[PDB]
Each structure stands twice: as C-alpha cells, then as structure tokens.
Amino acid sequence: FMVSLPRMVYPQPKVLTPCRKDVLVVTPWLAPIVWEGTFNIDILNEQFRLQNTTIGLTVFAIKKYVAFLKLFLETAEKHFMVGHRVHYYVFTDQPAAVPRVTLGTGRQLSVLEVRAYSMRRMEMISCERRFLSEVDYLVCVDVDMEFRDHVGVEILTPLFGTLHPSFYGSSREAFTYERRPQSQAYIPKDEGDFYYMGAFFGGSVQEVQRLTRACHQAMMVDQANGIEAVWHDESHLNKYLLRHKPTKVLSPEYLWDQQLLGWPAVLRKLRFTAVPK
Amino acid sequence: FMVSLPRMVYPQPKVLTPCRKDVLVVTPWLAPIVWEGTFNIDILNEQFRLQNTTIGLTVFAIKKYVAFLKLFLETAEKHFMVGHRVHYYVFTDQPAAVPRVTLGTGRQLSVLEVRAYSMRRMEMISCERRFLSEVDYLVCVDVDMEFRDHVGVEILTPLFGTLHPSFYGSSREAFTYERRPQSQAYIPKDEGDFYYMGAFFGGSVQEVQRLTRACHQAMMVDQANGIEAVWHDESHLNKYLLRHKPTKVLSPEYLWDQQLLGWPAVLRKLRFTAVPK
Ligand SMILES: O=c1ccn([C@@H]2O[C@H](COP(=O)(O)OP(=O)(O)O[C@H]3O[C@H](CO)[C@H](O)[C@H](O)[C@H]3O)[C@@H](O)[C@H]2O)c(=O)[nH]1
Ligand SMILES: O=c1ccn([C@@H]2O[C@H](COP(=O)(O)OP(=O)(O)O[C@H]3O[C@H](CO)[C@H](O)[C@H](O)[C@H]3O)[C@@H](O)[C@H]2O)c(=O)[nH]1
Ligand SMILES: CCCCCCCCO[C@@H]1O[C@H](CO)[C@H](O)C[C@H]1O[C@@H]1O[C@@H](C)[C@@H](O)[C@@H](O)[C@@H]1O
Ligand SMILES: CCCCCCCCO[C@@H]1O[C@H](CO)[C@H](O)C[C@H]1O[C@@H]1O[C@@H](C)[C@@H](O)[C@@H](O)[C@@H]1O
Ligand SMILES: [Mn+2]
Ligand SMILES: [Mn+2]
Numbered sequence: 001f002m003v004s005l006p007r008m009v010y011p012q013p014k015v016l017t018p019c020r021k022d023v024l025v026v027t028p029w030l031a032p033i034v035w036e037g038t039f040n041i042d043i044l045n046e047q048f049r050l051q052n053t054t055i056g057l058t059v060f061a062i063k064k065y066v067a068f069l070k071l072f073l074e075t076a077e078k079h080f081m082v083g084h085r086v087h088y089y090v091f092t093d094q095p096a097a098v099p100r101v102t103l104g105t106g107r108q109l110s111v112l113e114v115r116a117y118s119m120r121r122m123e124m125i126s127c128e129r130r131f132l133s134e135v136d137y138l139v140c141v142d143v144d145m146e147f148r149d150h151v152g153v154e155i156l157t158p159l160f161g162t163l164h165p166s167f168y169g170s171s172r173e174a175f176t177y178e179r180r181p182q183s184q185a186y187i188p189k190d191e192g193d194f195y196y197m198g199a200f201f202g203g204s205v206q207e208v209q210r211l212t213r214a215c216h217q218a219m220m221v222d223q224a225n226g227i228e229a230v231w232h233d234e235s236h237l238n239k240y241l242l243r244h245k246p247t248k249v250l251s252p253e254y255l256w257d258q259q260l261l262g263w264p265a266v267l268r269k270l271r272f273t274a275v276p277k
Numbered sequence: 278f279m280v281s282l283p284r285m286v287y288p289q290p291k292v293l294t295p296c297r298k299d300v301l302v303v304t305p306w307l308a309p310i311v312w313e314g315t316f317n318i319d320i321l322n323e324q325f326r327l328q329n330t331t332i333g334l335t336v337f338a339i340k341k342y343v344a345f346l347k348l349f350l351e352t353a354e355k356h357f358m359v360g361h362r363v364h365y366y367v368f369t370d371q372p373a374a375v376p377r378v379t380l381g382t383g384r385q386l387s388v389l390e391v392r393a394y395s396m397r398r399m400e401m402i403s404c405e406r407r408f409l410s411e412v413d414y415l416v417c418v419d420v421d422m423e424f425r426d427h428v429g430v431e432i433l434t435p436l437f438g439t440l441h442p443s444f445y446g447s448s449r450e451a452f453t454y455e456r457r458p459q460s461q462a463y464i465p466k467d468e469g470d471f472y473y474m475g476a477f478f479g480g481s482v483q484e485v486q487r488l489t490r491a492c493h494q495a496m497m498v499d500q501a502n503g504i505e506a507v508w509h510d511e512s513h514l515n516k517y518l519l520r521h522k523p524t525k526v527l528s529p530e531y532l533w534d535q536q537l538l539g540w541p542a543v544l545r546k547l548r549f550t551a552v553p554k
Pocket of ligand 5 (some may be wrong): 142143144199
C-alpha cells in the first residue's frame with residue numbers, strides 16, 4: 001500500500017515541450033532510459049522514502065582490487081542514494097584490507113569473505129536468503145570506479161541495465177555480443193537492442209536473483225561444452241537482457257570513462273566513472 | 278515468473294535518435310506517456326501474451342446511453358486488445374437493451390444490472406471480488422465513444438490516466454480542477470501535473486480498486502459536507518492521480534473529439550473518439 005504524496009510545488013511538465021530532444025528517453029518496450037532532465041528527483045525521493053526503501057549495493061574487491069575500495073566507498077557516501085537506507089555488501093578475499101570508511105546515518109556495510117580466483121560474481125549474488133530479508137533492491141557494480149555526481153532512486157525498478165559507454169552510438173552488428181552458436185550467450189547479427197555493460201546492473205532482489213541465476217547456469221553449460229563467451233559474464237548479461245527486457249535502462253551518465261571517451265555534449269552529468277588502472 | 282522472449286527481428290532502437298521530438302514521452306516521475314512511435318507493439322504483444330493477460334473493460338450504459346453500446350462494442354471488437362483475452366462488463370439498467378454483438382475468440386461479455394440515477398461509477402467498480410478472480414487489468418471507459426484505431430497492451434501498467442483532449446496544452450492554473458478548499462478534490466493553482474479525463478482510466482485490478490475506493494470515499498465526505506465537485510468524479514480522479522502518480526499516461530490519441538478539436542499534427546492516430554450526442 002502506497003500512501004498519498006504530500007503537497008509539492010514544482011515546475012509543471014509540459015506535454016508539448018520534451019525534456020530532451022537529443023536522445024531516446026524511452027525504449028520500444030516502454031521502459032524509461034534515464035538521462036539528466038528526464039526526472040524530478042524530489043518527486044522520486046518522496047515516492048521511495050514513503051516506501052522506506054532499502055538499497056543493497058554489492059561490490060567485489062578480490063586480490064589487488066581491494067585498493068579501489070576507499071575511493072569507491074567514500075564517494076558512494078557523497079553521491080549514492082543519500083537520504084535512503086543503504087546496505088553495502090563487500091565481497092573480498094582480504095577482509096582486513098577493507099578500509100574503515102565513515103558512513104552516514106541509516107547506512108551499513110557488511111564484509112563477506114570469499115575465495116579468490118567469469119563465474120564468481122553471478123554465482124555469489126544468486127546470498128539469496130540474506131538479500132531477500134535485508135534489502136528491497138540490489139545494485140551490482142564494479143569497484144574500480146568512483147561516484148562524481150548523483151546516483152539515486154531514479155535508477156530503481158524491477159530490472160535495469162546500463163548502456164556501455166563505448167557502444168551507445170553503435171549499430172547492433174558492431175556490438176561485441178557472443179557470436180558463436182555453440183555458446184548459451186549467442187546473439188545473431190540481426191538481434192539486439194543495446195549493449196549493456198557488466199559493471200552496473202540491478203533491480204528488485206527477486207529479479208536480480210533471477211538474472212544472476214540464469215547467467216550462472218548459462219555459464220556452467222558453456223563450461224561443460226568447453227566454450228567461454230568472448231566477454232564472459234557480460235556476454236550472458238546481454239543475452240539475458242535481450243530475452244528479458246529491463247524495466248529501466250541507465251544512460252552512460254551512469255557508467256563513463258572520461259580518460260578514454262572525454263565528455264560528449266550528450267552527457268550533462270558524469271555520475272559514476274572509471275578509475276585509471 | 279516471466280519466461281524468455283523468442284528470437285524477434287525488428288528495427289534497432291537508436292539512442293541518439295528520439296522516436297518523437299515534438300512531445301513529452303516520459304513524465305518527471307519516469308512514467309511513459311504513450312504516443313504512436315514510442316512502442317514496438319510486437320515486443321509488447323509477446324510480453325503480455327507470455328503472461329496470458331486478461332483485460333477487463335467496464336462500461337456504463339444507463340438510461341438513453343444504451344443506444345451507444347452497439348457501435349462501442351463492435352468497434353472494440355475491431356481495435357481493443359485484439360489477440361488477448363478480454364472480458365467486457367456492461368453495467369446497465371436495461372439488460373434487454375444490450376445489443377447482441379458477435380465476439381472474437383477468447384472474448385466474453387457479462388451484463389450487470391444496476392439501479393438508474395457522480396457517485397455511481399466509482400462505487401460500482403470498487404464488483405471487487407469478481408474482478409480479482411477474472412481479470413489481470415481493468416480498463417474503465419465512457420460508452421459514448423468508438424474505437425477507430427489500435428488500443429492495445431501498450432496501455433497496461435499498474436495505474437494509468439489519460440490526458441484530457443481539451444487541456445493537454447494548458448498551463449495548470451487553467452485546469453478545471455476543483456478549486457474550493459472545502460472539497461476533498463481541492464487542488465490549488467500551483468499544483469498539478471496534468472488534467473486527466475474521467476472517460477478512460479485503468480490499471481491492475483488492485484490499483485483500480487484503490488483508486489475507485491478512494492474516489493468514492495472522497496465523494497461521500499463531500500456529500501456529507503454539502504459540496505459537489507465542479508466536475509464530479511473527474512475532479513476526484515484528478516486529485517487521486519496528483520497524489521498517486523500513474524505508472525503510464527495515455528496521450529490524447531486515446532481520448533479525442535474530432536468534431537470539437539479536429540486532427541492536430543501532434544496526433545498520428547485517433548484511436549478512441551467521441552460519438553456526437
Ligand atoms: O582481480 C580482480 C578482477 C576483477 N575484480 C572485480 O571484477 C570487476 C570487473 O572486472 P574489471 O573491472 O577488471 O573488468 P570490466 O568491468 O572491464 O568487465 C568486462 O570485462 C571483463 C573481462 O576483463 C568481463 O568480460 C566482464 O564480464 C565485462 O563486464 C572489478 O571491478 C572488480 O570488482 C576483482 O575484484 N579482482
Ligand atoms: O444518463 C447517463 C449518463 C452517463 N452515463 C455514463 O457515464 C459516462 C460519462 O458521462 P458523459 O459521457 O455524459 O460525461 P463526460 O464523459 O463528459 O464526463 C465528464 O463530465 C461529467 C459531467 O457531465 C462528470 O463531471 C465526469 O466526472 C467527467 O469525466 C457515459 O459515457 C456513460 O457511460 C450513462 O450511462 N447514462
Ligand atoms: C587499451 C585500453 C583498453 C580501452 C579500450 C576498451 C574500449 C571498450 O571497452 C571494453 O568493452 C568490452 C566489450 O567490448 C568490455 O566491456 C570491457 C571494456 O573495457 C573496460 O571499460 C572501458 C570503458 C574502459 O574503462 C576499459 O579500460 C575497461 O577495461
Ligand atoms: C458546447 C458543447 C460542449 C463542448 C465543450 C467542452 C470542452 C471541454 O470538455 C469538457 O471538459 C470538462 C472539464 O473541464 C469535462 O471533462 C467535460 C468535457 O466535455 C466532454 O468532453 C469533450 C471533449 C466533448 O466531447 C464534450 O462534448 C463532452 O461533453
Ligand atoms: Mn571495471
Ligand atoms: Mn463521455
């Protein structure tokens with residue numbers, strides 16, 4: 001049950017004035033594509049706070065990648081879901097190397113020890129009972145990253161992927177999907193909506209567990225058949241999101257590499273960006 | 278559980294090419310606004326057929342309005358949810374005046390007798406147990422109308438309203454919301470997203486029952502206080518959808534009066550239109 005919104009004063013949306021005329025803001029299956037200018041964050045914050053929403057953020061920091069945790073977490077504190085309930089889940093082979101980072105109120109961090117050495121992340125996420133009890137949504141991101149700007153409840157939805165920053169302008173034949181019919185991740189050259197990056201996906205706990213289960217099972221079949229998809233779990237993520245359309249798509253504002261790709265006119269904000277390695 | 282979509286060949290959506298540049302296609306709370314060119318109906322039909330979706334359509338034909346049923350139903354057969362399961366619910370004081378209309382396969386019609394003589398429609402819809410058992414979505418429309426073009430699963434969502442054809446270009450101060458603070462339907466001049474028409478709303482059975490219950494209760498409070506909102510149940514519908522944002526908004530393609538308003542450039546299709554009375 002969703003209670004009433006309070007009175008709010010904000011600019012009237014105008015039917016004959018698009019927010020953005022330079023980009024596609026809705027997919028052909030009527031999922032929003034999230035760009036700056038498409039959302040009133042005050043309205044969304046109200047809606048999600050009225051549901052007392054809890055967001056889980058999973059991040060893997062295995063072997064040398066523990067060095068990325070300090071900047072990742074400190075910048076997450078500045079920019080990720082501020083004002084909402086957040087539970088970070090840090091999967092690592094080195095629990096003692098996790099930096100002591102000061103958290104804002106309503107935010108917690110759990111260290112989950114794992115084995116070191118593409119199958120690990122999808123298998124590890126598909127924690128099943130814990131996430132169902134503790135959070136409403138799961139967001140699954142790369143650690144070799146930093147938040148530079150707002151990443152908030154505008155992303156939340158049953159299932160989302162993120163446009164790969166290298167391929168948002170590419171035609172589908174150029175996408176680096178797995179192209180061998182012998183792989184479970186196979187997508188032919190005449191199929192595909194978008195190329196999603198493995199570094200930022202999420203959704204409700206239920207939908208994220210479905211996706212990660214399916215990708216894990218598909219990767220196991222491939223392993224048994226002696227094939228490894230060209231881009232590993234990303235290849236399977238793309239296969240999954242082709243056959244199970246996401247209910248929102250994040251623009252490349254949400255996954256950018258400024259060193260590689262600069263700052264194009266189409267990006268009004270760079271929100272979550274690659275750290276040099 | 279949603280099974281996989283089959284392989285499909287369709288045009289690739291392009292991130293740097295908007296479908297429509299002339300209209301707002303997503304609200305500031307990230308609900309799609311449904312216009313022609315925003316959706317691939319083949320994808321949506323697949324998604325909704327894979328869930329074996331059943332759509333209930335409610336229509337009231339009381340007193341002289343029974344005369345509108347023949348054209349309403351015959352044109353619904355040509356254009357409304359064709360290929361999907363449909364259950365029409367015709368509420369009338371004259372069961373014997375309901376025309377015998379031939380239905381396509383998978384479609385059924387129930388005649389529900391009611392009393393003759395704004396409270397009736399919201400009260401009557403909030404049938405509660407029957408709809409929950411028989412349909413997935415409810416669509417609630419005026420009878421003095423005809424379908425001229427496709428109205429399909431693109432509209433389905435937990436909660437939707439439709440932009441009133443007279444007001445989609447209007448600023449909010451000009452909207453004919455109820456303006457007296459003594460009414461439950463009161464909306465001040467600095468609030469409001471859109472002006473929704475009472476003639477086409479819907480959603481999941483649960484959300485439609487919530488809306489109709491709330492509007493019925495609000496109208497009862499008004500009656501007890503000796504006030505009747507300026508546009509009756511439409512005034513309350515607008516209050517409800519202000520405080521409970523719809524998850525899709527239908528463009529005026531879905532509710533048009535060609536005699537009054539012609540055929541503006543912004544409408545690529547006229548789907549569901551007023552019959553002269
Ligand atoms: O030694 C490692 C390697 C990786 N990671 C974790 O795995 C994440 C992903 O690894 P990278 O950042 O090195 O790789 P990309 O994000 O470039 O991932 C893409 O390239 C990969 C192969 O390099 C796979 O194909 C993957 O599916 C695809 O999304 C890292 O952020 C980190 O969280 C570790 O913790 N330790
Ligand atoms: O004698 C009647 C009158 C109305 N109706 C039913 O009620 C529907 C709505 O009535 P109208 O078509 O006459 O009115 P509008 O659609 O123009 O409705 C708008 O104007 C109404 C007052 O005229 C209310 O304010 C209502 O909330 C607002 O949406 C009709 O389609 C019909 O289904 C009947 O069956 N018999
Ligand atoms: C010559 C150097 C490597 C830089 C060129 C990489 C450009 C394409 O990005 C890569 O795309 C792959 C799928 O085709 C896969 O997702 C890995 C991805 O590379 C990662 O993401 C990029 C945006 C960069 O941050 C890159 O460094 C990172 O490895
Ligand atoms: C002088 C004649 C009446 C025609 C002028 C009506 C224009 C405005 O439409 C009316 O708007 C009201 C809210 O302000 C309320 O929704 C009723 C609505 O009138 C109905 O819908 C219109 C689009 C027409 O189909 C109209 O005939 C119908 O009554
Ligand atoms: Mn990375
Ligand atoms: Mn009418």
